[PDB]
RNA sequence: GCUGAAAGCAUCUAAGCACGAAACUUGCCCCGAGAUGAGUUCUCCCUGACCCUUUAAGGGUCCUGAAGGAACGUUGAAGAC
RNA sequence: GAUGUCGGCUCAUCACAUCCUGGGGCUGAAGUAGGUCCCAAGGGUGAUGCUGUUCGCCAUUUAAAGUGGUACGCGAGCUGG
RNA sequence: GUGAAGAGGGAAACAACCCAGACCGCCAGCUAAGGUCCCAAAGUCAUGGUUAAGUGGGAAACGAUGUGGGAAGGCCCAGAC
């Protein structure tokens, strides 16, 4: 997880979600994709 | 929205039972049911059922279509129900049921068991096979998801419990 | 002339019986609010208590809008350093129902000896039986 | 589960056969005598009300007298309750007995221990005390600061500080039963039970265990 | 995490359903009805006359003195008092 | 027309930007042991040689020897280097 | 310009900010700034919208399929995404 006040899709397979307002990035390929927004 | 366009076909021996919002699905496998949103028509019709929002209600369409994603999968549900099978990879690694408990040796200094719930059922072919069976697809889902809990499919070996059709992603610890 | 003047000992006050099911609660409690100081007479005096008694049913059926169920906090402090604690709107209602529809009221009821007397004619009640068959309350629509 | 009755008789050792020395505490247990049954209906809870030993005639007044009379039990020196729980049973005048802690292996002991009268603060909360020497003057056992300064401008509740220290009530939570002696009335549990030699003690199957 | 649309797919979330920490509420111990919102249970005690006017949750006289308490004394592993 | 100062001692109390213990994501995470971020303030969080020292450096511990606020907390509480 | 050397009403409290300049009395009326659910005087007023965070009722670069309005382009029943 990366907590981050920028958080953006760093590859294709990267997919924006919004889980109880927080903005969240969520890849399929590459777990340090993970991104939380805060 | 969309989806909620497509009705849900009802094929013989199934029967539904509509109460406002509560309704209720018959079948070879058994009773489900469930409340839908205060927010979706249905309505039977000749063999089909249809989904709609109602009035003053914003967003219905995206309940609308949860609706009939949920219906549909109920059809199927208490007819020939749902199958989930679940792989166990790493030596020593077992299964097995006894009536309504999975026994599980899993590597642990102590004994795992999982306790099925009521429409759940499961066999092994295998030791290191599981498959399970019911109506329920979210329950079913439950269920193997809280089996593969217990060891999850480690990234250096795929060592644990795992779906059986699913990909693992191995990797190597530095070179050699 | 002066103008008339309440006395305590000739005022007459009714018995009421509110059913709190489902009603916002605040618009419920600025009404027993205003009914217990007596703003609805017109011999109302602000230094006399010329409010009427109410029971209030169903405390525990009281209804918050929005997100309030789980994020309205009722905090106190209880005098030792330690001392702030606080419960959300749900763990109040599961432990003592009738203080959310109690600290409401007596937070919009005057301060002071009088305000206080106010509060002593308010009776809340979880389920919807009350004791107080022999005064004979009359239903109140809120 | 129910507890009894007892009185601190003392102190004493049991040698065990293989060379062990365990310190125990004598607790004499009388019959206790269920005074008074407490129901949901009447009472709101389930409890039973229970005396023990024995008190003289001309110092019993009227009203525990009638109390007594009622149970049709004779008059003991204290009645004590014990909270029910949900399998128990009990009827008024029934006498409840020593052997009720035959195979229980664990006690709760409750008293009221010694008076240590106004205690200052290095014996009661374990203060540090301040230097007997190098220049300090007449504050050797004082509590030294109590407070911080204008921020906080008080002084905190809670604060420890010199006053009574014992002779209140104590338990101490599960303690070996050594020994259940029905015919002699005695209970020997391991260790140290808080009171004076003659006073009262309750006596609880351990909670915690 | 499960099921799942908005957005034919994907998605832990929007409807719905699971887990999840020495933090929170309890569970353990102690105080605690001046909780003036002053609660409950059990037991005990007292069921005599008259007078006045200012008439009322009025005063006064005679007889009566309970259950209990206090006081005093001998004291305490209780205690500055 | 007076708000006593550094340090020590005694006694603390709060914040969380967490030192330990607790939970978790990622790892250039095989394991052991780490790195980094997130949640978490319940409890805990050294004895000394030197120096007035705070600090610091050393010597040995410890699960750890937290960072700060409180008139650089505390002299109608002590000391007075 | 105000305070100083100016009270009254408003800004919770709040010389210096907003309204406004107290000769005395009245248990009369209309207004200012500010207000009109309760504390606490007066709209739980009318009509049309927006917001779902208690935003309203503290804070930037920057980030995001959160929604409501324009304004125009692509791609599409010869089949678009």
């Not at chain 2, 839908?36 to 914003?58: C, Q, S």
């Not at chain 3, 009914?35 to 918050?64: F, Q, S």
């Not at chain 4, 009755?5 to 040698?15: A, D, H, L, N, P």
Request: some cysteine.
């Amino acid at each position: 997880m990366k907590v981050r006040a920028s958080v953006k899709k760093l590859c294709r397979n990267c997919k924006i979600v919004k889980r109880d307002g927080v903005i969240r990035v969520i890849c399929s390929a590459e777990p340090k994709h993970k991104q939380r927004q805060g | 929205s969309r989806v909620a366009k497509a009705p849900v076909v009802v094929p013989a021996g199934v029967d539904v039972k509509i109460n406002g919002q509560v309704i209720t699905i018959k079948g070879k496998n058994g009773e489900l049911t469930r409340t839908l949103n205060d927010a979706v028509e249905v309505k039977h019709a000749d063999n089909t059922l249809t989904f709609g929002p109602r009035d003053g209600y914003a967003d219905g369409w995206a309940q609308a279509g949860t609706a009939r994603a949920l219906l549909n999968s109920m059809v199927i549900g208490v007819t020939e129900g749902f199958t989930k099978k679940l792989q166990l990879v790493g030596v020593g690694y077992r299964a097995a049921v006894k009536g309504n408990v999975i026994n599980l040796s899993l590597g642990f200094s102590h004994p795992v068991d999982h306790q099925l719930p009521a429409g759940i059922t499961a066999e092994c072919p295998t030791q290191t096979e599981i498959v399970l069976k019911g109506a329920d697809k979210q329950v079913i889902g439950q269920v193997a998801a809280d089996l593969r809990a217990y060891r999850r499919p480690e990234p250096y070996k795929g060592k644990g419990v795992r779906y059986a059709d699913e990909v693992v992603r191995t990797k190597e610890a530095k070179k050699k | 002339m002066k103008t008339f003047t309440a006395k305590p000992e000739t005022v007459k006050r009714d018995w009421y019986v509110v059913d709190a099911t489902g009603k916002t609660l605040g618009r419920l409690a600025t009404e027993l609010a205003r009914r217990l100081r007596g703003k609805h007479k017109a011999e109302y005096t602000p230094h006399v208590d010329t409010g009427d008694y109410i029971i209030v049913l169903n405390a525990d059926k009281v209804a918050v809008t929005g997100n309030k169920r789980t994020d309205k906090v009722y905090y106190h402090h209880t005098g030792h350093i330690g001392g702030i604690k606080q419960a959300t709107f749900e763990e109040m209602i599961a432990r003592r129902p009738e203080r959310v529809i109690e600290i409401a009221v007596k937070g919009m009821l005057p301060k002071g000896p009088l305000g206080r007397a106010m509060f002593r004619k308010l009776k809340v009640y979880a389920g919807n039986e009350h004791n107080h068959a022999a005064q004979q309350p009359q239903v109140l629509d809120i | 589960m129910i507890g009894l009755v007892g009185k601190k008789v003392g102190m004493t050792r049991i040698f065990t056969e293989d060379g062990v020395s365990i310190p125990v505490t004598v607790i004499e247990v009388e019959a206790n005598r269920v005074t008074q049954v407490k129901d949901l209906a009447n009472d709101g809870y389930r409890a039973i009300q229970v005396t023990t030993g024995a008190k003289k005639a001309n110092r019993v007044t009227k009203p525990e007298a009638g109390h007594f009379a009622k149970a049709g039990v004779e008059a003991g020196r204290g009645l004590w309750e014990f909270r029910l729980a949900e399998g128990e049973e009990f009827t008024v005048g029934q006498s409840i007995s020593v052997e009720l802690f035959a195979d229980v292996k664990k006690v709760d002991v409750t008293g009221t221990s010694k008076g240590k009268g106004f205690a200052g603060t290095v014996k009661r909360w374990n203060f540090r005390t301040q230097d007997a020497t190098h220049g300090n003057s007449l504050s050797h056992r004082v509590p030294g600061s109590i407070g911080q300064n204008q921020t906080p401008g008080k002084v905190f509740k809670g604060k420890k500080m010199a006053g009574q220290m014992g002779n209140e009530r104590v338990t101490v939570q599960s303690l070996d039963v050594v020994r259940v002696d029905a015919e002699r009335n005695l209970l020997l549990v391991k260790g140290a039970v808080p009171g004076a030699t003659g006073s009262d003690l309750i006596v609880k199957p351990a909670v915690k265990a």
